[PDB]
């Protein structure tokens, strides 16, 4: 019965063990990194074919 | 609530995409050390001596190129796959912020007497069993 | 001669660093098998996805083997078998229902879409992996789509249709003099071990628990016939394995035989089905002692194939599978996993490694001494 | 113990590596007065310009000029209503802005001159110039010594900087960069850029300034940040007079450590000519050739580098230096003469480019200096 949403009393904090394991979740920070170590990665090859260019 | 569930939404898709961003950088991965080696012997001051060397040098850019081509393409429509659907993830999360802060509204009320069923025949299902 | 050996860390071999050729395909992990049933190919994908999220690309050279032939799979199988297998569907199995009791298709080798593209990919991968060990452009293949080893001449049993693991050791045969089979998977090598009782040019040797279980076959005195004797080892064992016992009951074996038999070419597989919470399993070894048997196999510089078989639980396979190919790689891994498509199927913890069960080891030591006994005393007579 | 004081050794560059560096410099720069009695004094940067165009260094080196930033692009810092007042006000109608320059802190301190929004714009184009020039990848090094003032707030222009282009130089580095190492000589606290990056990772804003008693006031040990930007914010904080030998022992150790851990991209090293000997407010007793030691050490690693200008309230010691250190980012070293220029008169009795230090208290004990690095190891090795 942990299903039950949450009521309009902001009762985030104190929750059902499962909505702060999601507003804890650092994943959205790796994948950032994630995504701008790909964009580095493309942007060394994007000034090489400049160059070329 | 729907901030919680578009959170949850977030990672899945980004990672199902990012997953295929790597499968296809996993098949062109061996040609970039070597399209970096052939441009920087290319670039070299002291290469020019002898023409058959600069048109080998050449050709073997130009046939480098022509096999890299293919996995840029793919990495262009699996990016544009990647926009598309986290544009819809936004919108979905900005909508339900901008409906959370607007009022610190019946239709919602009813889907909250519509899952109160569901978790009241979810907990009898345990007394009955 | 059998003596207790505590388990240690795995640490890679830094005197060799071979090609590794991971074939793959992306359309065997769309294949199922059932609704309840426990062999999933999505172990593939899983694994797949796992090797790709962990950045192991930049080694490896990835491949995409070309499906094999009817004309390449009737090199072992009968023409009959093959011609049904092809023939038969999903929905027309009532008119072929005469070669599904004569062929065994049904009861544990359900019919399912694509299945004879199934059986055609799986028998291409080891295809196209034995072709790169046979040419020198390689030295490792692991051919994770294979690993069917319970399939027969003119019979399909144990969720396994064509017999890859025979195509590609006889490939190998092609130009090698000598080649030598491995397994670790918790069942018996049945097909493999049958195919070549009557000649020394293969050696099946296969780690299976014994007793009432699903092979039934495979004791100690199955040393061989004709030609072949002496040439067919077996070391059954019992439920409750750990990873010492495992190491100190696979290395001496594996030791002697190369020392005798003097192996041109090496196949391994690689049962996912021997570690600790497994469904279909009784054993209890874990990552490390699963990697331990490719480490030490592949630290005798020999060319080898590691195919892929078993394995009814995900995360265990599908952390089992990729620990084997970063070892193969002489790289050891991060052991943390990185977010992907499967990450919530990836226990409470997201961690690599398993905990193996405390559940009770039953191989007294007398018991794995006399049955080295047995190994070695057959052994030599060659 | 960490620190470990070592001779100074001459200067040495690499002579195979070549390092492509696009100088930057507005005409304009050098024509805003903030007063009679005002320290700031922007003709250093006109006067070290005329320098560099006499040493001959215009034949290794490129140099261009920067579009003045646009009012939008000044905002991606401050608020809107700072920049709206800054380019309203004027020295001759500030009795209807009394209560605004009040609210903004500005008047009193920092004073209101005629063409102020020009050089802020001015310092802003050349900071966001050299950091889109840096991630296009044409110029290893992208020089703007008219920017660097990292006084300023968000809100409120204190220390005599209205605009802070060193912010807006990261954000634009940022833009295709995970971490950049930002690194501080100016003798005060950089309290703008440490007050904007003080809750964040993606940056390392390294600092090396004295705590005492001053106008900023900040920069302790035991701020090190909030968030994720704990343990983000290396402070080290120094005392009167330390010289060549020792600053360097400081300096080396550090920046090595943080660039064998934190791995940055890019750099935007400060270049400060306030920390010299002879300075008007500045305490310490660095010499030219210490205040250039940092910068080779910074070059010699071979990643991109954002050098910039700052604070510096002498002229002649001011141009030498950043001259010089122009120089030396050519792996070139400049002879101790100083070819005539129109400003020729300005450089002092000596009429050599160097700054000598002069004879004050060595308040820096090395027991401090130890303490301090052990503190900062602490704090570092959590990245
Ligand atoms: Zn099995
Ligand atoms: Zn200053």
Redesign the pocket.
């Known amino acids: 019965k942990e299903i039950l949403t949450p009521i309009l009393s902001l009762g985030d904090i104190i929750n059902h063990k499962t909505i702060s394991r999601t507003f804890s979740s650092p994943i959205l920070k790796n994948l950032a990194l994630q995504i701008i170590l790909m964009i580095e990665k493309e942007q060394m090859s994007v000034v090489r074919y400049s160059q070329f260019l | 609530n729907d901030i919680t569930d578009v959170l949850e939404e977030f990672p899945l898709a980004t990672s199902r995409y990012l997953t295929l961003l790597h499968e296809i950088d996993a098949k062109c991965v061996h040609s970039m050390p070597n399209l970096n080696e052939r441009i920087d012997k290319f670039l070299k001051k002291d290469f020019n001596k002898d023409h058959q060397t600069q048109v080998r040098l050449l050709n073997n850019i130009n046939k480098i190129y022509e096999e890299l081509m293919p996995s840029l393409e793919e990495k262009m429509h699996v990016s544009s796959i990647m926009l598309d659907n986290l544009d819809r993830l936004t919108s979905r999360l900005e909508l339900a912020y901008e409906v959370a802060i607007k009022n610190t509204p019946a239709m919602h009320l009813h889907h909250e007497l519509m899952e109160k069923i569901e978790s009241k025949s979810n907990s009898k299902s345990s007394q009955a069993l | 001669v059998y003596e207790a050996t505590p388990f240690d860390p795995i640490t890679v071999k830094p005197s060799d660093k071979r090609r590794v050729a991971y074939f793959y395909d992306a359309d065997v992990g769309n294949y199922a098998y059932g609704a309840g049933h426990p062999m999933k190919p999505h172990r593939i994908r899983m694994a797949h996805s796992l090797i790709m999220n962990y950045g192991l690309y930049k080694k490896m050279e990835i491949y995409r083997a070309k499906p094999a032939t009817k004309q390449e799979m009737c090199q072992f199988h009968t023409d009959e078998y093959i011609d049904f297998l092809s023939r038969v569907t999903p929905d027309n199995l009532e008119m072929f229902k005469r070669e599904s009791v004569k062929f065994n298709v049904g009861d544990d080798c359900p019919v399912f879409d694509g299945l004879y593209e199934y059986c055609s990919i799986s028998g291409g991968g080891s295809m196209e992996g034995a072709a790169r060990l046979n040419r020198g452009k390689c030295d490792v293949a692991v051919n994770y789509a294979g690993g069917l080893h ?1 399939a027969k001449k003119s019979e399909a049993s ?1 969720f396994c249709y064509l017999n890859d693991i025979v195509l590609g050791i006889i490939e190998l045969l092609r130009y090698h003099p000598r080649v030598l089979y491995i397994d670790i ?3 018996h090598g049945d097909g493999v071990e049958e195919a070549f009782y009557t000649t020394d040019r293969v050696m099946t040797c296969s780690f299976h628990k014994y007793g009432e279980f699903f092979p039934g076959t495979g004791e100690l005195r199955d040393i061989g016939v004709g030609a072949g004797k002496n040439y067919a080892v077996n070391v059954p064992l019992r439920d409750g394995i750990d990873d010492a016992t495992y190491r100190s009951v696979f290395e001496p074996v594996i030791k002697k035989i190369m020392e005798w038999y003097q192996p041109s070419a090496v196949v391994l597989q690689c ?1 996912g ?2 570690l600790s919470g497994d469904r ?2 009784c054993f209890n070894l874990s990552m490390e002692g699963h990697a331990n048997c490719v480490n030490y196999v592949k630290s005798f510089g020999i060319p080898m194939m590691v195919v892929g ?2 394995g009814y639980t995900m995360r265990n396979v599908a952390r089992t599978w990729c620990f084997e190919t970063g070892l193969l790689n002489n790289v050891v891994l991060d052991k943390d996993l990185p977010y992907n498509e499967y990450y919530e199927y990836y226990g409470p913890d997201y961690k690599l490694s398993v905990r193996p069960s405390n559940m009770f080891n039953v191989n007294t030591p007398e018991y794995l001494d006399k049955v080295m006994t047995n190994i070695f005393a057959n052994l030599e007579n060659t």
Do not use: A, Q
């Open positions: 319970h144990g998977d918790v069942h049962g089905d021997s279909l399993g078989g078993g």
